[PDB]
UniProtKB/Swiss-Prot annotation, chains A, B:
The active site is at 41 (for 3cl-pro activity), 145 (nucleophile). The gene is rep. It is found in: Host cytoplasm; Host Golgi apparatus; Host nucleus. Residues 1-306 form the Peptidase C30 domain. It comes from the Viruses. Changing residue 189 to A: Does not affect ability to cleave and inactivate human TRMT1. Inhibited by pyridone-containing alpha-ketoamides compounds 13a and 13b. In turn, alpha-ketoamide 13b (tert-butyl (1-((S)-1-(((S)-4-(benzylamino)-3,4-dioxo-1-((S)-2-oxopyrrolidin-3-yl)butan-2-yl)amino)-3-cyclopropyl-1-oxopropan-2-yl)-2-oxo-1,2-dihydropyridin-3-yl)carbamate) inhibits SARS-CoV-2 replication in human lung cells. Inhibited ex vivo by michael acceptor inhibitor N3. Inhibited ex vivo by compound 11a and 11b. This is 3C-like proteinase nsp5. Residues 1-306 are cytoplasmic. 3CL-PRO exists as monomer and homodimer. Only the homodimer shows catalytic activity. Interacts with host FBXO22; this interaction promotes the proteasomal degradation of nsp5. It comes from Severe acute respiratory syndrome coronavirus 2. Cleaves the C-terminus of replicase polyprotein at 11 sites. Recognizes substrates containing the core sequence [ILMVF]-Q-|-[SGACN]. Cleaves and inactivates human TRMT1, preventing tRNA guanine(26)-dimethylation of tRNAs. May cleave human NLRP1 in lung epithelial cells, thereby activating the NLRP1 inflammasome pathway. May cleave human GSDMD, triggering alternative GSDME-mediated epithelial cell death upon activation of the NLRP1 inflammasome, which may enhance the release interleukins 1B, 6, 16 and 18. Also able to bind an ADP-ribose-1''-phosphate (ADRP). It catalyses: TSAVLQ-|-SGFRK-NH2 and SGVTFQ-|-GKFKK the two peptides corresponding to the two self-cleavage sites of the SARS 3C-like proteinase are the two most reactive peptide substrates. The enzyme exhibits a strong preference for substrates containing Gln at P1 position and Leu at P2 position.
Length: 306, 306
């Protein structure tokens, strides 16, 4: 028993992390097969970032201007291309530690682990969610750009995020591994508006099920409610609306606990209107939305990876 | 910026995890050089655990009764010994992925990462603290015994914990890698009393410094206080007393933020007596004690490992 904000084991990703230097700027790259992926703004100086013309800056660069280091193994760049907001550096060596992997574009509310890196070396791993406004609330310092987010399914690494920017508000923005930003953000040092950040309701419900599984049931009540009545309340507190697809995803947790999804919703409704009264759930004094229904099932069933 | 409950990268530990089977029971072992370390209760049946006589049970076992699997590599046991509550299994193969490592016995209030494993395969990684009563509040299911806790300093893995038991209260107990339990616990399925769990004050202060570094300063006040007056209040709320050694450890954070340790203590005193008023600090509605002063400095400075 017990419940923890658990990240994926990072070992398969650690062996893919490299340092990328272009002139004076150094960040992290991801070395898969014979290609290194990194944020295109590795080619910018601090001044360039205010209003970069990436095609013109990249035109001034040649394969030999990029220095790629993996530990004390310098890789040779023999081709380079810009794909959206990522640079693809073709190197002469295939990464011997390349895992089975895929690139995936996740949806808001999905969770993943981040391996925070500096100078191509791993610092720490943590789990986070893609917020509904396509930001992440990370922990990143200067030099962490190119750090990656991932999931694992059995033996395959799904890369879903590359870190690019800290917004002036302290939240973080990045791209998929095809270089398309999540959200309306651009890789420019300019004021940028993130939308309203709503709470991921389907995830809150999942965590309430986790709480029940683990012996925390004080919040269970014998009211019930309808999906429309619940969404009416959710929206007042900036909670995402629940759809039938969400009810479908929660089914297995409903079955395991004997608590129907709409009954759990009525419990949530009461917590929203009346608060937690200085009580806690799974050691938390706030409702938690960084566990998906799949995360809960995974943690409560002991799934492993190879 | 940002602050996250960050675990160490787990890759160096992943390659040390093996499955250990003795008759019908299977758990995790730690393979370093040519020795496998695992909980001695791998030799017990479910019935044996109520009142095991470990010497007599072990006397019935021979090297060939233990099955050690690392992926699809079966290791041969050629010698075995019991050291306190761990079994040392001498195997015929040195682990090629043995990191630089040491065994350390940590003190209450220190933090470490746990790599939760099942059947010798990693499931997830999370960071936790040794509580003052020598328990941990983990996430462990059946079969996770032998999962290990560790820290990394540059290139060296310090193993500090092996998981052995879930107490009837849902909290977790285990040993150092010499097999000595943390706390007064025994590897027997019997009711066991953990002490009062106090809050780790030096860690709370560290996290308050982290909050300031990250822009959360609403809780700063212009009261001050003395160490004795503060400890008088701490004890009323089941907080560990602060000593001069703790004040010494916080010095660098004091210097970086310009806030003296005793001033930070007066801020804490006010939060204890008046609560947080439905406000948050670093996204939390409770005071957090699972970051040490070293963790804060490490996360706020970007330390990496090799
Ligand atoms: Cl909280």
């Amino acid at each position: 028993s017990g419940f923890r904000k658990m990240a994926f084991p990072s070992g398969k990703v650690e062996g893919c992390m490299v340092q990328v230097t272009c002139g004076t700027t150094t960040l992290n790259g991801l070395w898969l097969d014979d290609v290194v992926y990194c944020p295109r703004h590795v080619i910018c100086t601090s001044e360039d970032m205010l209003n970069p013309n990436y095609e013109d800056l990249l035109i001034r660069k040649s394969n030999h201007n990029f220095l790629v280091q993996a530990g004390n193994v310098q890789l040779r760049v023999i081709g380079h291309s810009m794909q959206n907001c990522v640079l693809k550096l073709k190197v002469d060596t295939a990464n011997p530690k390349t895992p089975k992997y895929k690139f995936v574009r996740i949806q808001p509310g999905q969770t993943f682990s981040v391996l925070a890196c500096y100078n191509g070396s791993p610092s720490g791993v943590y789990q986070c969610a893609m917020r509904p406004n396509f930001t992440i609330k990370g922990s990143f310092l200067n030099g962490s750009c190119g750090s990656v987010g991932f999931n694992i399914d059995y033996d395959c690494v799904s890369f879903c995020y590359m870190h690019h920017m800290e917004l002036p508000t302290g939240v973080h923005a990045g791209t998929d591994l095809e270089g398309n930003f999540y959200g309306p953000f651009v890789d420019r040092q300019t004021a940028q508006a993130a939308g309203t950040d709503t709470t991921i309701t389907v995830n809150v419900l999942a965590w309430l099920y986790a709480a029940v599984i683990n012996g925390d049931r004080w919040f269970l009540n014998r009211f019930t409610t309808t999906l429309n009545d619940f969404n009416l309340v959710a929206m007042k507190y900036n909670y995402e609306p629940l759809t039938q697809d969400h009810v479908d995803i929660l089914g297995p947790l409903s079955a395991q606990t004997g608590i129907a999804v709409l009954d759990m919703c009525a419990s949530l409704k009461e917590l929203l209107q009346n608060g937690m009264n200085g009580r806690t759930i799974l050691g938390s004094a706030l409702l938690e939305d960084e566990f998906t229904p799949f995360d809960v099932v995974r943690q409560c069933s002991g799934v492993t990876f190879q």
